[PDB]
Write a protein that binds this ligand. Structure first.
Ligand SMILES: *[C@@H]1O[C@H](CO)[C@@H](O[C@@H]2O[C@H](CO)[C@@H](O)[C@H](O)[C@H]2NC(C)=O)[C@H](O)[C@H]1NC(C)=O
Ligand SMILES: *[C@@H]1O[C@H](CO)[C@@H](O[C@@H]2O[C@H](CO)[C@@H](O)[C@H](O)[C@H]2NC(C)=O)[C@H](O)[C@H]1NC(C)=O
Ligand SMILES: [Cu+2]
Ligand SMILES: [Cu+2]
Ligand SMILES: [Cu+2]
Ligand SMILES: [Cu+2]
Ligand code: NA
Length: 495
């Protein structure tokens, strides 16, 4: 069952064994992934998050971000700890009360405190469109058509040893999968389809790190949505999906009744599918209950290439059709050395006072805001360009901007910009050495918006800045409830 748009959401510790290995976790709604939060476009979400965490090994504070939702006028509800709020302390609750005007698509929610979402606090968030322009492309779109891709670790996120390479221990598809080492034949997820029907599969990367090469043996996938943005139909046979991205694709159940492997190959961790790792099962109604016997091709015929995506709507690109053709054109120097990432020479370390509270308390320029050098002001009502040249270790880095989606004027692995009809999205791979992935957006959403690599380990190691968008209108735009105002004093008192 989906929950919302008005719902409680309990955050608890529990043991889970999604790949046959038991470990404690941080869960929303008692499950991994958490329950799907859903509503319709324009709805008022009121998600009362109950922090019932007691195991300090995964942090007993929490804060939840609603990934991809713009939070216009509700910056305080965005969730990134020490950017828009202090964490919720254990035994307390907090009502994230916001609206979703002008958005409809596939989103997700996750802890936004430290690396806590890796420990399990992640789930889908769907804003349905009663008049979806893509509605006539499919027959079924419901909780059974959401596909989550997750990395899963046997070591707790706070306990990953300093200086050891972090890699996952399993890929989980809809919460189930098999471990890369000491593989046991634990249950695989089954996605069931009826021959002849067409399904809106909502593919959600809830990854903390790896990108996945996602495919379904025997089937093609017609992309119709990218990170909440409706796209023209683009048929592919493989999707490389980076952390935090979403796609909807139409799956036409047009193959012989049978079982077909669903594949999600991460870029690190276990390679291949031995023992049924990196796998789930697409089962047609009437098929025998047994594992697929299909194989992947050696080479996919039509992998997704981001430049092939185009918005369904005439979204264009703001600004002028050349590099620097913006009101505020930025080029960030993204670097890694010695275990720390930096942006323009500053490694992000969260401040004591949330950025939003600093602004509300009177800090009125970015030089007043902490962390020093980590907060960049953006002028209001302006076209922003941000070039994100890659090269920093650990890539490809999926950069994500809160509060906004953006035109992807230049994509990974292709030096040619597109000032005409690029896809808009909210999380973008910045590609490889020499690339110059570049985004554009207009600043019509006052508040401090995080920009960071969505590889959670990289965020934790400093790969972030805050855009303090329209500082002058931030307080007026984002009236705060008393309960928000109460968070920092409670947090700081609890220590
Ligand atoms: C990525 O594109 C940006 C522009 O969007 C390039 O930035 C320019 O860099 C040149 C030379 O380094 C400067 O003289 C310009 O002033 C920069 N433009 C802006 C808006 O600052 C950048 O060089 C490109 N990077 C890569 C690696 O191709
Ligand atoms: C590299 O990216 C460019 C820009 O997005 C792609 O160029 C577009 O190609 C389409 C499809 O042929 C044309 O209709 C557009 O006119 C092109 N736009 C520009 C600005 O050149 C190009 O296809 C991408 N390369 C690959 C190999 O996919
Ligand atoms: Cu996110
Ligand atoms: Cu986000
Ligand atoms: Cu990264
Ligand atoms: Cu974030
Ligand atoms: Na334009």
């Amino acid at each position: 069952a989906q929950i919302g748009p008005v719902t409680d959401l309990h955050i608890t510790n529990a043991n889970i064994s999604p790949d046959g290995f038991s470990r404690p976790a941080v869960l929303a709604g008692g499950t991994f992934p958490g329950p799907t939060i859903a509503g319709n476009t324009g709805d008022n979400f009121q998600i009362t998050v109950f922090n019932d965490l007691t195991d300090p090994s995964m942090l007993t504070d929490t804060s939840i971000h609603w990934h991809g939702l713009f939070q216009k006028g509700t910056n305080w509800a965005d969730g990134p700890a020490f950017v828009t709020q202090c964490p919720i302390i254990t035994g307390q609750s907090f009502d994230y009360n916001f609206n979703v005007p002008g958005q409809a698509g596939t989103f997700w929610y996750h802890s936004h405190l430290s690396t806590q979402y890796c420990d399990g606090l992640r789930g889908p968030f769907v804003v349905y469109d009663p008049n979806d322009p893509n509605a006539s492309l499919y027959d079924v779109d419901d909780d059974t058509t959401i596909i989550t891709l997750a990395d899963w670790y046997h070591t707790l996120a706070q306990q990953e040893p300093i200086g050891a390479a972090i890699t996952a221990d399993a890929t989980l598809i809809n919460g189930l999968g098999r471990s890369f080492t000491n593989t046991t034949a634990s249950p695989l997820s089954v996605i069931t389809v009826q021959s002849g029907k067409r399904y809106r599969m909502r593919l959600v990367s809830i990854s903390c790190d790896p990108n996945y090469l996602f495919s379904i043996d025997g089937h093609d996938m017609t992309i119709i949505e990218v990170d909440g943005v409706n796209s023209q139909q683009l048929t592919v046979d493989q999707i490389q999906i980076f952390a935090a991205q979403r796609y909807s694709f139409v799956l036409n159940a047009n193959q012989p009744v049978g079982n077909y492997w669903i594949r999600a190959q991460p870029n690190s961790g276990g390679q291949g599918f031995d023992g049924g790792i990196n796998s789930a099962i697409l089962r047609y109604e009437g098929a025998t209950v047994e594992d697929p016997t299909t194989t992947a091709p050696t080479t996919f015929s039509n992998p997704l290439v981001e430049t092939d995506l185009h918005p369904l709507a005439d979204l264009g690109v703001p600004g002028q059709p050349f590099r620097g053709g913006a009101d505020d054109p930025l080029v960030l120097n993204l670097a890694f050395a010695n275990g720390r990432f930096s942006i323009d020479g500053v490694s992000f370390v969260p401040p004591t006072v949330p950025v939003l509270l600093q602004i509300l308390s009177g800090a009125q320029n970015a030089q007043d805001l902490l962390p020093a050098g980590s907060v960049i002001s953006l002028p209001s009502n302006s076209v922003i360009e941000v070039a994100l040249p890659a090269g920093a270790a650990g890539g490809p880095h999926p950069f994500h901007l809160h509060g906004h989606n953006f035109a992807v004027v230049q994509s990974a692995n292709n030096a040619t910009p597109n000032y005409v009809n690029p896809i808009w999205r909210d999380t973008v791979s910045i590609g490889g050495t020499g690339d110059n992935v570049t985004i554009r957006f207009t600043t019509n959403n006052p508040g401090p918006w995080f920009l960071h690599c969505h590889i959670d380990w990289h965020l934790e190691a400093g790969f972030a800045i805050v855009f303090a968008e329209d500082i002058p209108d931030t307080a007026s735009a984002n009236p705060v409830p008393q309960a928000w105002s109460d968070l920092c004093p409670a947090y700081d008192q609890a220590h």
